[PDB]
Amino acid sequence: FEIPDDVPLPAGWEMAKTSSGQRYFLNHIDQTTTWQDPRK
């Protein structure tokens, strides 16, 4: 149902850039990097 309007990623998360020109999401909670967010 449409997109919410609160926060893209929870705490311990850092949207950053990897590969060459794509924004990833540096997961600090479990040390990892995902292009999409766990909560949309």
Partner: peptide
Amino acid sequence: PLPPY
């Protein structure tokens, strides 16, 4: 692919 932390 993807940056391995």
